[PDB]
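Reminder to self: keep the SMILES exactly as supplied, no canonicalising. Ligand is HJD.
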Amino acid sequence: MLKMEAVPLRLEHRQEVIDIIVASFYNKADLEQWLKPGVLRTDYSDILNDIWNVLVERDLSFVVYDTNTDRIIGTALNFDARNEPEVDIKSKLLIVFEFLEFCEGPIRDNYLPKGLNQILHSFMMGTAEKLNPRENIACMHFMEHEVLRVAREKQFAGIFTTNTSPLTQQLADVYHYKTLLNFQVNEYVHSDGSRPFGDAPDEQRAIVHWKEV
Ligand SMILES: NCCC(=O)NCCc1cnc[nH]1
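Structure tokens returned for the bound complex:
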């Protein structure tokens, strides 16, 4: 059985976390696949490197170790939704985060509690490529169990996230997240009038989830 341990994010974890996040969102990503081409492996390392110190300082993120190998197999990058770093993303990933803000912004700032230390934004969650289905399913449950524990320990009012893959969306629903938006990603219009995910099927959703803790 997979034996896992959730360790808070340390500064030395940068390259291990970047590898996992690139693996989970490069050509495997449900939104990034439609921005092909022009999205390189380094675009997510660039974002993570720009926010790495603040991400570790906020002490809201953790990595998941396989205690049998003492290697990181998963990570949950979290921020206070009302206290996130300012990112000038100079890649095509700007459309992704502008789309996520398009999904989150209106709901966050109008229907979610006001003030800091209220909204725990589970904005990124990744697992290692080597994980087989069982290891991945088990690691996803472990990270969900831990973001709740971190949310309660850090005294947040609830967990807030936009789930962009069918697996994370289903996990959120069986974990009793409330659905606050079920948006069809091929209907989102970029600033230039185009639909960056217009080639995605109608069935691909960006679901904004929220569970009070
Ligand atoms: N509870 C899961 C949160 C998560 O990992 N969401 C990823 C959304 C995303 C896609 N591309 C950039 N961000």
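Points to follow up:
The pocket of HJD is lined by residues 25, 29, 31, 96, 100, 122, 124-125, 161-164, 168 (CB under 6 Å).
The chain is about 35% helix and 25% strand.
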